[PDB]
Amino acid sequence: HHMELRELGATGLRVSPVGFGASPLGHVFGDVPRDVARAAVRRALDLGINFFDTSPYYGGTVSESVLGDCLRAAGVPRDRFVVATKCGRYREGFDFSAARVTRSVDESLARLGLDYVDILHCHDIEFTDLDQIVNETIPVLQKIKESGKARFIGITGLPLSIYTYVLDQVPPGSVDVILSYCHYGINDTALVDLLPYLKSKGVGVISASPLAMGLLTDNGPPEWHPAPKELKLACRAAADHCKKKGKNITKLAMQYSLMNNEISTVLVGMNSPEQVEENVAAAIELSTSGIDKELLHEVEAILEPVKNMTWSSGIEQA
Ligand SMILES: NC(=O)c1ccc[n+]([C@@H]2O[C@H](COP(=O)([O-])OP(=O)(O)OC[C@H]3O[C@@H](n4cnc5c(N)ncnc54)[C@H](O)[C@@H]3O)[C@@H](O)[C@H]2O)c1
Ligand SMILES: [Mg+2]
């Protein structure tokens, strides 16, 4: 069994439904040895994952250096995989200006050891005036796209409102994809309200953080996690409910995020071959056998009170 590739917007690209996020929980592949990173990526390639997301932000540009390292190490044709990186967000702060993103793409390419990336996104745009993205950044990224250094252009961020603001205010065709996170998983599925709109605009959809950055795991979220306490407690109840039955919330959550074919890929942060295996397995078992609907229904009931509860991100707008 393979995983069933999905079409990504109007880009032509065919992507694995499970995608590899190269920085889980805001760390470059967690904090695992390089050999383990290299092996996770190797294992991902071997198991039919062909989509890799990174950025110059998490780990101060080392996410990209390590992914570049891991990719060429695995030794596979350039056209066998799809890479996305981002621009605008750096450890030293945000800068979406024309000169910064133009040099950004080159730096990324140098760190990644590639000639082009498949996707370049503007990163977490809720941290700047959204008119700068409309009026400066997107235009510049067209020129980067023209140059060949990126094939397609993306926007990313947390609040779903960034996406209508931008996509309403740029000429049709300016943006190829969006990356949304934390809005397509058992506790939060608000992204669904955008899929028809984005389809109407010819924009492909990538979703990320199907476990909501660790809320839907046995281990629980990191201490920094910005969720309201209510959501944290509800997710702990869901995890405990699965546990007491000898079942795994992580698996249920991954499968759940994969059940909407209008989302082309779900980026999961992964740090080891074992996590790759479990998530690829979860995808395949969904395809071949379906989800556990009875467990899903009970977990849905626990999360019901906190459905689509979110948190603040970015700055005050216009
Ligand atoms: N604005 C943006 O563009 C933005 C922001 C957030 C995330 N992302 C992307 O999405 C990716 C995924 O998000 P995330 O990693 O923060 O959150 P997530 O919800 O994907 O959870 C990742 C966590 O779950 C653990 N995990 C994964 N599979 C597991 C399994 N089978 N069993 C047990 N634990 C498992 C990981 O080790 C990690 O701690 C990121 O690496 C990144 O590429 C994009
Ligand atoms: Mg404004």
Q: Which of 143, 136, 141, 202 is nearest to 167 (CA)?
A: 202
- Beta-bridge mates of residue 100: none
Flag whether 316 is in a domain: no
- Is residue 153 within 8 A of residue 119, CB to CB? The reply is yes
Q: At 267, list the tokens.
A: 């980026």
The residue contributing the CA closest to ligand 1 atom 13 is 209
13 contact partners, CB below 8 Å, separation of at least 6: 7, 82, 118, 152, 204
Question: Does 20 fall in a domain?
Answer: yes
Resolution reading in Å: 1.8
Q: Kindly state whether residue 318 falls inside one of the protein's structural domains.
A: no
How many domains does the chain contain in total? 1
In angstroms, the CA 49 to CA 254 distance is 15
User: What's the one-letter identity of residue 235?
Assistant: C
Range of the domain at 122: 1-307
Active site residue 58: yes
Ligand 1 atom closest to residue 55's alpha carbon, by position in its atom list: 43
The closest-lying atom of ligand 1 relative to the alpha carbon of residue 274 is: 31
Binding-site residue set: 23, 25, 53, 124, 129, 131, 156, 209, 211, 213, 269, 271, 275, 278-279
Within a domain: 56? yes
Question: Does residue 317 form part of some domain?
Answer: no
Q: Decide if 313 is inside a domain.
A: no
Please state, in angstroms and rounded to a whole number, the distance separating the CA atoms of residues 276 and 95: 33
Residue 9 lies in a domain: yes
